[PDB]
Amino acid sequence: RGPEKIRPECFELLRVLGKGGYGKVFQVRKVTGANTGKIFAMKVLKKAMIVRNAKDTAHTKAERNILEEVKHPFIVDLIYAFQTGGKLYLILEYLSGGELFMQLEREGIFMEDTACFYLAEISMALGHLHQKGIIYRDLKPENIMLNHQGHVKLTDFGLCKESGTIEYMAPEILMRSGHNRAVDWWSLGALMYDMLTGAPPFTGENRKKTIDKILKCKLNLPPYLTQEARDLLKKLLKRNAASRLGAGPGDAGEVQAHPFFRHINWEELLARKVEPPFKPLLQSEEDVSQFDSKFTRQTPVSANQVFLGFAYVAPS
Numbered sequence: 001r002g003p004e005k006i007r008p009e010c011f012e013l014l015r016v017l018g019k020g021g022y023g024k025v026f027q028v029r030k031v032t033g034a035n036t037g038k039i040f041a042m043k044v045l046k047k048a049m050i051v052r053n054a055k056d057t058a059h060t061k062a063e064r065n066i067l068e069e070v071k072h073p074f075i076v077d078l079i080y081a082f083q084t085g086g087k088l089y090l091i092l093e094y095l096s097g098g099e100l101f102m103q104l105e106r107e108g109i110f111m112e113d114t115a116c117f118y119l120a121e122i123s124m125a126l127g128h129l130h131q132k133g134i135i136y137r138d139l140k141p142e143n144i145m146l147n148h149q150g151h152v153k154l155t156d157f158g159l160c161k162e163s164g165t166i167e168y169m170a171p172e173i174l175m176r177s178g179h180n181r182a183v184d185w186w187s188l189g190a191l192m193y194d195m196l197t198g199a200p201p202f203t204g205e206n207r208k209k210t211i212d213k214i215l216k217c218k219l220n221l222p223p224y225l226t227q228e229a230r231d232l233l234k235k236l237l238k239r240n241a242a243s244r245l246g247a248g249p250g251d252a253g254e255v256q257a258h259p260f261f262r263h264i265n266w267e268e269l270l271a272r273k274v275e276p277p278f279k280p281l282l283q284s285e286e287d288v289s290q291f292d293s294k295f296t297r298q299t300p301v302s303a304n305q306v307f308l309g310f311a312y313v314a315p316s
């Protein structure tokens, strides 16, 4: 009758929220114990195929470490982690807010007032990650999600699906020519562009024809963008990594100091007091409204180290 064991049978599968090559994300209801009835996302990974690849294991382990060590309002919160013989289980907060760039489709385009807010929250998350010496690397629209209140939550610190996109990669990533944290500020620029124009800054016909447009780095500024937004984009989307904004020791502070964010109260923003442009309806805590419908039912289908000490219960 001591501390709760927290095995897979503590959760009821409600629905699929996404499938990948390495595993699945479910919406789950905890059915016994400390949060009996609360809704989580359950990420389930296949140990056997993770350990078949170094880079894959590296990402898994890193994530498991990041989500224990790094806790921030705009970063997904890990609640439990555990494992069985063949599977790894991560229990994160269920982010009923869905993807942010899913709104981009119904808006067509984000207004600068709106995009700013979300870029502002994202930047604060990126800034904290860098402070802990973590670079997020392959940042893309898919990764930005929203909580029940509609605030930004970064996610996907581990593996990829399929076993993705490349137009949000900085040039120095595609060249494989080494990269510092300045790589994440490019991604912010490319996300800003996507928000304010609908699609990525540079896009081609195929795998390598796309790369060429990114390497050449040609600014396609639409006239409706304000002076400041034009300036910030040409400062975030610089080819030369050293010349990029936020590349210097200023980092996030350097970015956040730009006139584009002149209206952001950072204290209130971080405290999540500023009302977000889009607050998603409720009608429940288990609402999957903006998680579209490729997903339904519920079914989960000796070198054990070192997922050794994988177990975790969040102190909160």
Ligand SMILES: CCc1cncnc1N1CCN(Cc2nc3cc(C(F)(F)F)ccc3[nH]2)CC1
Pocket (backbone or CB within 6 Å): 017, 018, 019, 020, 021, 022, 023, 024, 025, 040, 041, 042, 043, 044, 045, 076, 092, 093, 094, 095, 096, 145, 155, 156, 158, 159, 160, 161, 162
């Ligand atoms: C778990 C965080 C989350 C919380 N609440 C609601 N939605 C969420 N997500 C955020 C992540 N998102 C993308 C995604 N990453 C994946 C990784 C895998 C992998 F097993 F690694 F292969 C499988 C499916 C995946 N889908 C799915 C739904």
